[PDB]
Design goal:
It is found in: Host endoplasmic reticulum-Golgi intermediate compartment. This protein has 572 residues and is an alpha/beta fold. Helices cover 26% and strands 23% of the residues. It has a domain of 139 residues: Rossmann fold. It is globular, with a radius of gyration of 27 Å. The structure holds zinc ion (3 copies). The site of one zinc ion has 6 residues, from loops.
Length: 572
Amino acid sequence: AVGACVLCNSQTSLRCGACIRRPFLCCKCCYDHVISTSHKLVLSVNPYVCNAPGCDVTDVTQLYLGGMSYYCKSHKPPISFPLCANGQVFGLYKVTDFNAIATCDWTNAGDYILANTCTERLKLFAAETLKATEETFKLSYGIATVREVLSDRELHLSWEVGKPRPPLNRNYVFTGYQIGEYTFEKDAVVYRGTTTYKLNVGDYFVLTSHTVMPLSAPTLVPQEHYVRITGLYPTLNISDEFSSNVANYQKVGMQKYSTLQGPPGTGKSHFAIGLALYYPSARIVYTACSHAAVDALCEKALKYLPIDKCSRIIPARARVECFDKFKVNSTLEQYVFCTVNALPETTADIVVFDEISMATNYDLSVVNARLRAKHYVYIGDPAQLPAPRTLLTKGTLEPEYFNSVCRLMKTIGPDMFLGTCRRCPAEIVDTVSALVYDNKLKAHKDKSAQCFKMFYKGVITHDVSSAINRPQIGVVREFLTRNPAWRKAVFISPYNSQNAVASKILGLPTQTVDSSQGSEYDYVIFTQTTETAHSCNVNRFNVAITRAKVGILCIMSDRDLYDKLQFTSLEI
Ligand SMILES: [Zn+2]
Ligand SMILES: [Zn+2]
Ligand SMILES: [Zn+2]
């Protein structure tokens, strides 16, 4: 009931009862809130409500202190101060941007912009409010009761009347009833459970609405610049394999936190693991939001770091298959590999946060809150994909607004830039370099002469709002008959439904651009499917085409992005 003012820290008894997070506000700031927002309920030890029997006045602006008690204009005794006077609200110990965060629905880009240009304590209020709003939206969707069980991977679903139906992709994970987490794909729907259970008729699912704990730690601890490598002990014996990164490893030791922008295939994983071999005594916690990013860092560690000082942290509520080849849940091993939402309370000489474009400010805060560390290293690329903002429907979230790390990488620049792509044919490296990296990404590899583009708008059908372009898959099928080297290709599109159709007609393995991020394939077939803002997003486009080691076929809908592709054009 007595805490700190989320805007000026000042001690106060005053929470806003109208904010969903109920932040402590100081008298000077609590006024400036209630006098310019629909937010009028103020909380103290007791609520600022008229104390007269059967009176319903709760608006702080219509209330007075009557002795030690609160009354409205109609019930106040002659000797009474108004609670709102001279720019203050009476409490104990006696904002434009705070007002916009407190009252916004988080459906506009400008909301996320402001949640990332604001002060550091307001970034935490913002991140808390957003996540709370995100969760209380999941309740708004309808329950799914099973009508008929076809098989071991298909069923027919009965949806609740009046309440909307959530998108049926891998992004929306249901909880069955506690018969374990479950996902769906498109009257026959494809059902995939985190447990192998006899999925009964009349069993039901609901989206796992989790309780939003409060944030305490900043997104970014304050910066500290040192004169010498602090708390770390470098080798003089460092294998030539990691010689490129020695100057960057010494930057990491002479600062509190460092930022690494590594475009696709520029040696992020290599740099992360190479940090351990350069500071061989140092205890390192490797963390990312997804299980895939943490498992990728594990594969790289398996190759270069001793398996007996590596532990993969797996939360008891197991949701996906994880990296098996380390000791599981040994928190005190020199090398710990853990998703942000499973991080234990511990310390470390270096923390490496990877896939930073996928981190929210909520994730950036949790990390600083569970790990106390000499050095924090932030690895990713603001030109790759952000965490999905399920509430955002209006405006596009630019990369400088993804999180505080990406804002730093986009404003003042990253500390370290890996500038040579070793993965992609020059045609792909030259294209993305001009598109998202201001011509600063360089091609190691030669032009493959296996990078083709076809401008083919086709026909767009829709499985609800997820898009399909059968003619674009038809063009692919025709290409494959003449190009049997591509039979091994991964099919990629911005749409699950397009992928579903492509799986059946082509037989190729299938990835959404978003699920493809971090992965690499010899040959890639990309159908843009539509020319919407989703499919023309330059970040998503950048990821789509940089998955390819040898060849790529791009069937394009967008004249703009088609023209920019420095690929051999095809006909038909
Ligand atoms: Zn409020
Ligand atoms: Zn204040
Ligand atoms: Zn009253």
